[PDB]
Amino acid sequence: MKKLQIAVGIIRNENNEIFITRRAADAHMANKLEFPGGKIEMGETPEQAVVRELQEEVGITPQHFSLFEKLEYEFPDRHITLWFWLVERWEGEPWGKEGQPGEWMSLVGLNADDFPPANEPVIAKLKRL
Protein backbone atom coordinates (compact mmCIF):
# COMPACT_ATOMS: atom_id res chain seq x y z
CA MET A 1 0.00 0.00 0.00
CA LYS A 2 1.47 3.31 -1.18
CA LYS A 3 1.96 6.16 1.31
CA LEU A 4 1.80 9.82 0.26
CA GLN A 5 2.22 13.24 1.86
CA ILE A 6 -0.23 15.73 0.33
CA ALA A 7 -0.27 19.52 0.79
CA VAL A 8 -3.49 21.42 0.06
CA GLY A 9 -4.55 25.03 0.36
CA ILE A 10 -7.80 26.28 1.88
CA ILE A 11 -8.12 29.51 -0.11
CA ARG A 12 -10.44 31.88 1.77
CA ASN A 13 -11.48 35.32 0.54
CA GLU A 14 -12.80 38.28 2.53
CA ASN A 15 -16.42 37.14 1.99
CA ASN A 16 -15.95 33.81 3.82
CA GLU A 17 -15.88 31.89 0.53
CA ILE A 18 -13.39 29.15 -0.37
CA PHE A 19 -11.89 28.48 -3.81
CA ILE A 20 -12.82 24.87 -4.59
CA THR A 21 -11.91 22.73 -7.63
CA ARG A 22 -13.41 19.43 -8.81
CA ARG A 23 -11.29 16.34 -9.41
CA ALA A 24 -11.26 14.65 -12.81
CA ALA A 25 -13.47 11.64 -13.50
CA ASP A 26 -10.44 9.33 -13.89
CA ALA A 27 -8.54 10.45 -10.78
CA HIS A 28 -8.37 8.93 -7.34
CA MET A 29 -11.38 10.40 -5.51
CA ALA A 30 -12.92 11.00 -8.93
CA ASN A 31 -15.44 13.86 -9.35
CA LYS A 32 -14.99 14.99 -5.72
CA LEU A 33 -14.69 18.59 -4.65
CA GLU A 34 -11.27 19.42 -3.27
CA PHE A 35 -8.90 21.99 -1.89
CA PRO A 36 -6.21 22.53 -4.56
CA GLY A 37 -3.02 20.68 -3.68
CA GLY A 38 -0.85 17.69 -4.40
CA LYS A 39 2.04 15.46 -3.47
CA ILE A 40 4.96 16.82 -1.46
CA GLU A 41 8.02 15.97 -3.53
CA MET A 42 11.38 14.71 -2.33
CA GLY A 43 13.59 17.63 -1.35
CA GLU A 44 10.77 20.09 -0.74
CA THR A 45 9.02 21.02 2.51
CA PRO A 46 5.27 20.95 3.18
CA GLU A 47 5.30 24.76 3.06
CA GLN A 48 7.14 24.78 -0.28
CA ALA A 49 4.77 22.11 -1.63
CA VAL A 50 1.56 24.03 -0.94
CA VAL A 51 3.07 27.12 -2.63
CA ARG A 52 4.17 25.14 -5.69
CA GLU A 53 0.89 23.19 -5.93
CA LEU A 54 -1.29 26.31 -5.77
CA GLN A 55 0.93 28.00 -8.37
CA GLU A 56 0.53 25.00 -10.69
CA GLU A 57 -3.13 24.25 -10.11
CA VAL A 58 -4.80 27.65 -9.66
CA GLY A 59 -2.13 30.25 -10.42
CA ILE A 60 -1.73 31.97 -7.04
CA THR A 61 1.21 32.26 -4.66
CA PRO A 62 0.06 31.77 -1.05
CA GLN A 63 1.77 33.86 1.58
CA HIS A 64 1.58 34.22 5.36
CA PHE A 65 -0.41 31.00 5.60
CA SER A 66 -0.85 28.65 8.56
CA LEU A 67 -1.26 24.92 9.18
CA PHE A 68 -5.00 24.51 9.76
CA GLU A 69 -4.95 20.74 10.20
CA LYS A 70 -2.73 17.72 9.59
CA LEU A 71 -4.31 14.28 9.52
CA GLU A 72 -3.87 10.79 8.15
CA TYR A 73 -6.44 8.81 6.21
CA GLU A 74 -6.48 5.20 5.03
CA PHE A 75 -8.26 4.87 1.69
CA PRO A 76 -9.07 1.41 0.29
CA ASP A 77 -5.78 1.25 -1.64
CA ARG A 78 -3.51 3.97 -0.25
CA HIS A 79 -2.53 5.79 2.94
CA ILE A 80 -2.30 9.59 2.74
CA THR A 81 -1.10 12.27 5.18
CA LEU A 82 -2.87 15.54 4.40
CA TRP A 83 -1.47 18.95 5.30
CA PHE A 84 -4.34 21.49 5.24
CA TRP A 85 -2.95 25.03 4.98
CA LEU A 86 -5.26 28.01 5.60
CA VAL A 87 -4.48 30.57 2.88
CA GLU A 88 -5.97 34.00 3.51
CA ARG A 89 -3.43 36.12 1.63
CA TRP A 90 -2.01 35.46 -1.81
CA GLU A 91 -0.70 36.97 -5.01
CA GLY A 92 -2.86 36.41 -8.07
CA GLU A 93 -6.45 35.44 -8.76
CA PRO A 94 -7.29 31.71 -8.56
CA TRP A 95 -8.63 30.09 -11.72
CA GLY A 96 -8.81 26.72 -13.43
CA LYS A 97 -5.20 26.94 -14.54
CA GLU A 98 -5.05 23.22 -15.40
CA GLY A 99 -8.41 23.30 -17.20
CA GLN A 100 -10.25 21.96 -14.10
CA PRO A 101 -13.54 23.40 -12.76
CA GLY A 102 -13.02 25.87 -9.96
CA GLU A 103 -15.32 28.26 -8.15
CA TRP A 104 -15.86 30.19 -4.96
CA MET A 105 -18.09 28.43 -2.45
CA SER A 106 -19.54 29.87 0.74
CA LEU A 107 -17.99 28.23 3.78
CA VAL A 108 -21.42 27.78 5.38
CA GLY A 109 -22.73 25.94 2.33
CA LEU A 110 -19.95 23.35 2.05
CA ASN A 111 -21.19 19.75 2.18
CA ALA A 112 -18.54 17.33 3.45
CA ASP A 113 -20.20 14.55 1.42
CA ASP A 114 -18.99 16.34 -1.75
CA PHE A 115 -15.30 16.04 -0.66
CA PRO A 116 -13.06 13.03 0.00
CA PRO A 117 -13.96 11.51 3.37
CA ALA A 118 -10.56 12.49 4.73
CA ASN A 119 -11.74 16.13 4.62
CA GLU A 120 -14.68 15.59 7.02
CA PRO A 121 -13.10 16.94 10.26
CA VAL A 122 -11.51 19.84 8.36
CA ILE A 123 -14.77 20.98 6.78
CA ALA A 124 -16.40 20.76 10.22
CA LYS A 125 -13.62 22.80 11.83
CA LEU A 126 -13.80 25.44 9.08
CA LYS A 127 -17.51 25.95 9.73
CA ARG A 128 -16.61 26.64 13.39
CA LEU A 129 -14.41 29.66 12.55
Ligand SMILES: Nc1nc2c([nH]c(=O)n2[C@H]2C[C@H](O)[C@@H](COP(=O)(O)OP(=O)(O)OP(=O)(O)O)O2)c(=O)[nH]1
Ligand atom coordinates in the same frame (compact mmCIF):
# COMPACT_ATOMS: atom_id res chain seq x y z
N1 LIG B 1 -5.72 17.97 -3.75
C1 LIG B 1 -6.46 17.40 -2.78
N2 LIG B 1 -6.34 16.09 -2.52
C2 LIG B 1 -7.07 15.50 -1.54
C3 LIG B 1 -7.97 16.25 -0.77
N3 LIG B 1 -8.57 15.41 0.15
C4 LIG B 1 -8.03 14.21 -0.10
O1 LIG B 1 -8.33 13.20 0.53
N4 LIG B 1 -7.13 14.20 -1.11
C5 LIG B 1 -6.37 13.04 -1.62
C6 LIG B 1 -6.81 12.69 -3.03
C7 LIG B 1 -5.54 12.11 -3.62
O2 LIG B 1 -5.45 10.75 -3.18
C8 LIG B 1 -4.45 12.93 -2.96
C9 LIG B 1 -4.15 14.21 -3.74
O3 LIG B 1 -3.21 13.92 -4.75
P1 LIG B 1 -3.27 14.76 -6.12
O4 LIG B 1 -3.94 13.89 -7.16
O5 LIG B 1 -3.84 16.14 -5.84
O6 LIG B 1 -1.71 14.87 -6.47
P2 LIG B 1 -1.19 15.77 -7.69
O7 LIG B 1 -2.18 16.88 -7.95
O8 LIG B 1 0.25 16.11 -7.37
O9 LIG B 1 -1.18 14.71 -8.90
P3 LIG B 1 -1.10 15.12 -10.46
O10 LIG B 1 -2.09 16.24 -10.66
O11 LIG B 1 0.35 15.50 -10.60
O12 LIG B 1 -1.48 13.85 -11.18
O13 LIG B 1 -4.97 13.31 -1.68
C10 LIG B 1 -8.10 17.61 -1.02
O14 LIG B 1 -8.88 18.31 -0.36
N5 LIG B 1 -7.34 18.19 -2.03
Ligand SMILES: OC[C@H]1O[C@@](CO)(O[C@H]2O[C@H](CO)[C@@H](O)[C@H](O)[C@H]2O)[C@@H](O)[C@@H]1O
Ligand atom coordinates in the same frame (compact mmCIF):
# COMPACT_ATOMS: atom_id res chain seq x y z
O1 LIG C 1 3.80 27.05 10.21
C1 LIG C 1 3.06 28.21 9.89
C2 LIG C 1 3.04 29.11 11.12
O2 LIG C 1 4.28 29.78 11.25
C3 LIG C 1 4.09 31.18 11.20
C4 LIG C 1 5.11 31.90 12.09
O3 LIG C 1 4.98 31.53 13.46
O4 LIG C 1 4.18 31.61 9.85
C5 LIG C 1 5.41 31.34 9.21
O5 LIG C 1 5.28 30.23 8.34
C6 LIG C 1 4.40 30.39 7.24
C7 LIG C 1 4.50 29.14 6.36
O6 LIG C 1 5.75 29.13 5.68
C8 LIG C 1 4.72 31.63 6.40
O7 LIG C 1 3.72 31.83 5.41
C9 LIG C 1 4.81 32.86 7.30
O8 LIG C 1 5.20 33.99 6.54
C10 LIG C 1 5.81 32.59 8.41
O9 LIG C 1 5.89 33.70 9.28
C11 LIG C 1 2.65 31.41 11.63
O10 LIG C 1 2.09 32.59 11.09
C12 LIG C 1 1.95 30.18 11.07
O11 LIG C 1 0.82 29.84 11.86
Ligand SMILES: [Mn+2]
Ligand atom coordinates in the same frame (compact mmCIF):
# COMPACT_ATOMS: atom_id res chain seq x y z
MN1 LIG D 1 -0.92 18.95 -8.82
Ligand SMILES: [Mn+2]
Ligand atom coordinates in the same frame (compact mmCIF):
# COMPACT_ATOMS: atom_id res chain seq x y z
MN1 LIG E 1 1.76 17.23 -8.17
Ligand SMILES: [Mn+2]
Ligand atom coordinates in the same frame (compact mmCIF):
# COMPACT_ATOMS: atom_id res chain seq x y z
MN1 LIG F 1 -3.80 17.95 -7.12
